[PDB]
């Protein structure tokens, strides 16, 4: 009483119910470096202009 | 300081839109108006300088130089309108524009509170001067003279730019008032030694110092008359002004680091003066006299005493006026006889009596006749150098001989004796030349009455 599978039946993606837990760290990765602090706040105008030699603005 | 820059820059539409016959009249009139306007810089206070904005200021040292520059421009306009009478109109306007640009650059160089702005326009003064010398000079050697002048100045003054940027990065500012209140002593190291050399050598070349003066007896000779006025009456004093400004930051290394250079002037003002005893050229004689006087100024600045500083200010103003007048007289003789050699035209007092009187008065003011401000400056430098050391008075006193020994010599061979027989184109003196001589001389004798306005910022 065995039925031969048709075309594309064996190539299906199926689901599996298993008791073993999901590995939370399969790559054995360590702690990522902390990113740089972002930029925040409103843009105030430059204090006393360019401040390049004698230029006032 | 905007009340003098804007009319100076509006002089260019004035000289570019005028008619082909009234450029000289309009330019002379409005430059004389600006010279009259220049007297509002005398509002000086006994403690504080006159500060206009963040960009410009004027203490009591820059004020006589500014008044001298804006008084000198109409004099150049009146002098340089005879050898350019046959010139094309566009080239005439270009010459007047070069003079106007040179005055604008000078009068905003003398007032810059920030040092790199002072350097920028101190080198912007090179271009119109060099263009005038190499364009409207007469003979072949104007090109070599221009090359010598430009390359001496730039090769001396690029390390000044490097040192000034180093000062801006180290101290944090280049404003002269901030540097007056934030100045730190310079210790003893080789880095500070080359710092002093880089700050000093540009002004050493532009003073000129003896041994670096080889560009003066070329550029003062091949140039035209107005070029001679700016070369002898402002730019040397501009180097002296820069020296006075920048010697503030170089303490106390100067107390030994000025030791060679003083000798290089103390002997130098002897040798060049002796050159004037054996010069076959009138313009070269005036140039070497300028070398000697400015070497005396160098010694006065380097010993850094108050009396020497006021003597240096009075000496710079008086020498500028006297050298400009002497160049005018020599140019008049060159226009009349068409040669620059001194021995060709003799006995001119028999033919030109009033110009002989102007020659006598100019020579008397050249050899520091009291109570002229030439003698005041020379005397004050003498007192300060006697305080510095004793034997220096010998190096002063011998100079006090040799100066007269050429000045009256310059008075004799050009004015006294039997006249040259074959020279018969000695025209009578024009009103323009006499007016130029009087406008050169009468301010000097009037300044002898009230000299306290040219005695520096620590009077």
From Swiss-Prot, chain B:
GO cellular component labels: mitochondrial inner membrane; respiratory chain complex I
Enzyme class, broadest EC rank: translocase
Record keywords, A-Z: Electron transport, Membrane, Mitochondrion, Mitochondrion inner membrane, NAD, Respiratory chain, Translocase, Transmembrane, Transmembrane helix, Transport, Ubiquinone
Molecular function, one GO term: NADH dehydrogenase (ubiquinone) activity
NCBIfam families (alphabetical): NDH_I_M
Free-text function comment from the UniProt entry: Core subunit of the mitochondrial membrane respiratory chain NADH dehydrogenase (Complex I) which catalyzes electron transfer from NADH through the respiratory chain, using ubiquinone as an electron acceptor. Essential for the catalytic activity and assembly of complex I.
Disulfide bonds: none
Pfam family, one: Proton_antipo_M
Compartmental location: Mitochondrion inner membrane
Keyword Chaperone tagged: no
Recorded topology in the membrane: Multi-pass membrane protein
UniProt gene name: MT-ND4
Chief localization: mitochondrion
Catalytic activity reported: a ubiquinone + NADH + 5 H(+)(in) = a ubiquinol + NAD(+) + 4 H(+)(out)
Subunit structure: Core subunit of respiratory chain NADH dehydrogenase (Complex I) which is composed of 45 different subunits.
Taxonomy, superkingdom: Eukaryota
Protein name (Swiss-Prot/TrEMBL): NADH-ubiquinone oxidoreductase chain 4
Transmembrane intervals: 22-42, 60-80, 98-118, 147-167, 196-216, 224-244, 256-276, 284-303, 308-330, 351-371, 391-411
Organism the protein comes from: Ovis aries
Family: Belongs to the complex I subunit 4 family.
Gene Ontology process terms (BP): electron transport coupled proton transport; mitochondrial electron transport, NADH to ubiquinone; mitochondrial respiratory chain complex I assembly
Enzyme Commission designation: 7.1.1.2
């Amino acid at each position: 009483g065995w039925v031969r599978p048709d075309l594309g039946e064996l190539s299906k993606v199926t689901k599996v119910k298993t008791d073993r837990p999901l590995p939370e760290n399969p790559y054995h990765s360590r702690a990522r470096p902390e990113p740089n602090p972002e930029v925040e706040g409103d843009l105030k105008p430059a204090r006393h202009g360019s401040r390049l030699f004698f230029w006032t603005m | 300081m905007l009340k003098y820059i804007i009319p100076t820059m509006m002089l260019m539409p004035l000289t570019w839109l005028s008619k082909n016959s009234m450029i000289w009249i309009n330019t002379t009139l409005h430059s004389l108006l600006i010279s009259l306007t220049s007297l509002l810089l005398l509002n000086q206070f006994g403690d504080n300088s006159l500060n206009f904005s963040l960009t410009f200021f004027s203490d009591s040292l820059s004020t006589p130089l500014l008044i001298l520059t804006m008084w000198l421009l109409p004099l150049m306009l009146m002098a340089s309108q005879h050898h350019l009478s046959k010139e094309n109109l566009a080239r005439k306007k270009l010459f007047i524009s070069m003079l106007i640009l040179l005055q604008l650059f000078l009068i905003m160089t003398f007032t810059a509170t920030e040092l790199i702005f002072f350097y920028i326009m101190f080198e912007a003064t090179l271009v119109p001067t060099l263009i005038i010398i190499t364009r409207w000079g007469n003979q072949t050697e104007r090109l070599n003279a221009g090359l010598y002048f430009l390359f001496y100045t730039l090769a001396g003054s690029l390390p000044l730019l490097v040192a000034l940027i180093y000062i801006q990065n180290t101290m944090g500012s280049l404003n002269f008032l901030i540097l007056q209140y934030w100045v730190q002593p310079m210790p003893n190291s080789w880095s500070n030694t080359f710092m002093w050399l880089a700050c000093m050598m540009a002004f050493m070349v532009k003073m000129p110092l003896y041994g670096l003066h080889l560009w003066l007896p070329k550029a003062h000779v091949e140039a035209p008359i107005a070029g001679s006025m700016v070369l002898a009456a402002i730019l040397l004093k501009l180097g002296g002004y820069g020296m006075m400004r920048i010697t503030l930051l170089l303490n106390p290394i100067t107390d030994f680091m000025a030791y060679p250079f003083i000798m290089l002037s103390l002997w130098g003002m002897i040798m060049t003066s002796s050159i004037c005893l054996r010069q076959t050229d009138l313009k070269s004689l005036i140039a070497y006299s300028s070398v000697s006087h400015m070497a005396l100024v160098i010694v006065a600045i380097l010993i850094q005493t108050p009396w020497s500083y006021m003597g240096a200010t009075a000496l710079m103003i008086a020498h500028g006026l006297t050298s400009s007048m002497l160049f005018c007289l020599a140019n008049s003789n060159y226009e009349r006889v068409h040669s620059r050699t001194m021995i060709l035209a003799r006995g001119l007092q028999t033919l030109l009596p009033l110009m002989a009187a102007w020659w006598l008065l100019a020579s008397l003011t050249n050899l520091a006749l009291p109570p002229s401000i030439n003698l005041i400056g020379e005397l004050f430098v003498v007192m300060s150098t006697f305080s510095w050391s004793n034997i220096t008075i010998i190096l002063m006193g011998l100079n006090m001989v040799i100066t007269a020994l050429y000045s009256l010599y310059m008075l004799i061979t050009t004015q006294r004796g039997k006249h040259t027989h074959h020279i018969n184109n000695i025209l009578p003196s024009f009103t323009r030349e006499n007016a130029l001589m009087s406008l050169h001389m009468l301010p000097l004798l009037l300044l002898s009455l009230n000299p306290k306005i040219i005695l520096g910022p620590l009077y």
